[PDB]
Amino acid sequence: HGYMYIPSSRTRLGHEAGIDSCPECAILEPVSSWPDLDAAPVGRSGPCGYNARDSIDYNQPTTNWGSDAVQSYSPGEEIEVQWCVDHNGDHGGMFTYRICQDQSIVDKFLDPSYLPTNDEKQAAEDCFDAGLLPCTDVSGQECGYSADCTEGEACWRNDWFTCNGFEASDRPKCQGVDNAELNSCYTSIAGGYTVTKKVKLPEYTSNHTLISFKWNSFQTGQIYLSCADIAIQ
Ligand SMILES: *[C@@H]1O[C@H](CO)[C@@H](O)[C@H](O)[C@H]1NC(C)=O
Ligand SMILES: [Cl-]
Ligand SMILES: [Zn+2]
Ligand SMILES: [Zn+2]
Ligand SMILES: [Zn+2]
Ligand SMILES: [Zn+2]
Ligand SMILES: [Zn+2]
Ligand SMILES: [Zn+2]
Ligand SMILES: [Zn+2]
Ligand SMILES: [Zn+2]
Ligand SMILES: [Zn+2]
Ligand SMILES: [Zn+2]
Ligand SMILES: [Zn+2]
Ligand SMILES: [Zn+2]
């Protein structure tokens, strides 16, 4: 149970605008989330997520999200990205942020009068996967491997970020990465914990594009997707 928090995702704005009772509830399931991180089709969730609870498709803008960039950054700029995991839904696993560098695909997700098809959502996923923002692109950022994976397996990569293991120190799972206080960010079910990293933005410019957050659960056959509207100029 989780969603992207910084920069403010469509999921965050959705909650803050009164529309989304459970921002953390945008789940893709059932899927094989593990150990092949990119195998599972995104179906209806797409790169921005679909919230079954409130029946919100975030892949399309409304009056409350997706109208314009929430934040503007510079090409190649190193930025803070944060997601929020629920106290009762810390599934461990691995997460990544991506930018699709094909504007004609992303445009289909910036029009309030158009809902992208399942075909377009998958095309975008594929584009986003080409535009993954590796942990290791930020100099000085320590990029560990998953305690729930072994060398050679499809999950054994450190372009993606990893949560801590379950049986780990006294900093387990995704909460353990920041080891922040409860309610360091908002979730509706049991209160939230921040999970904070850095990414380096591409030398790719847009007045309006997306960062798509993807969390592949270890504990569960579930994926969590959010997107944030940004500019790189
Ligand atoms: C954004 O839009 C304005 C007006 O068209 C333009 O001057 C600016 O240079 C654009 N930057 C982009 C597309 O990155
Ligand atoms: Cl993926
Ligand atoms: Zn969950
Ligand atoms: Zn609130
Ligand atoms: Zn993918
Ligand atoms: Zn794969
Ligand atoms: Zn726009
Ligand atoms: Zn800046
Ligand atoms: Zn600039
Ligand atoms: Zn365009
Ligand atoms: Zn088609
Ligand atoms: Zn494909
Ligand atoms: Zn190191
Ligand atoms: Zn395994």
Output the 3-class SS for 135-196. HHHCCCCCCCCCCCCCCCCCCCCCCCEECCCCCCCCCCCCHHHHCCCCCCECCCCCCEEEEE
CA of 40 to the centre of ligand 6 (A): 8
Residue carrying the six token digits 């995991």:
85
Query: Which neighbouring-strand residues pair with 83?
Result: 4, 195
Whether omega before 134 lies within 30 degrees of 0, making that bond cis, reads no
- 208 assigned ligand-binding residue: no
**Two tokens at 221?**
């056959």
Going by alpha carbons, the residue nearest to atom 7 of ligand 1 is 207
Going by alpha carbons, the residue nearest to atom 2 of ligand 1 is 207
**What is the residue-wise DSSP string for 35-53?**
S-TTTS--TTTTTT-EETT
CA distance 199 to 141: 9
CB neighbourhood size of 220 (10 A): 18
- Cβ 181 vs Cβ 56: under 8 Å: no
Going by alpha carbons, the residue nearest to atom 6 of ligand 1 is 207
CA distance 97 to 199: 8
Atom of ligand 1 nearest to the CA of 205: 14
CA of 31 to the centre of ligand 14 (A): 15
Q: Reduce the DSSP state of residue 105 to 3 states and report it.
A: helix
CA of 45 to the centre of ligand 10 (A): 23
Atom of ligand 1 nearest to the CA of 231: 14
CA distance 41 to 119: 10
| Solved with | X-ray
**Two tokens at 88?**
């009762």
CB neighbourhood size of 38 (10 A): 13
| Structure's resolution in angstroms | 2.0
Query: Which neighbouring-strand residues pair with 200?
Result: 78
CB neighbourhood size of 104 (10 A): 7
H or E element in which residue 208 lies: strand 206-216
User: Pick from 87, 96, 88: which is nearest to 184 by CA?
Assistant: 87
Residue among 201, 203, 207 to mutate when testing ligand 1 (max atoms within 8 A of CB): 207
- Cβ 226 vs Cβ 58: under 8 Å: yes
- Residues near ligand 12 ion, CB 5 Å cutoff: 126
CA distance 216 to 222: 7
Q: What's CA 134's distance to the chain center, in Å?
A: 13
Atom of ligand 1 nearest to the CA of 232: 14
CA distance 185 to 6: 10
CA distance 137 to 230: 20
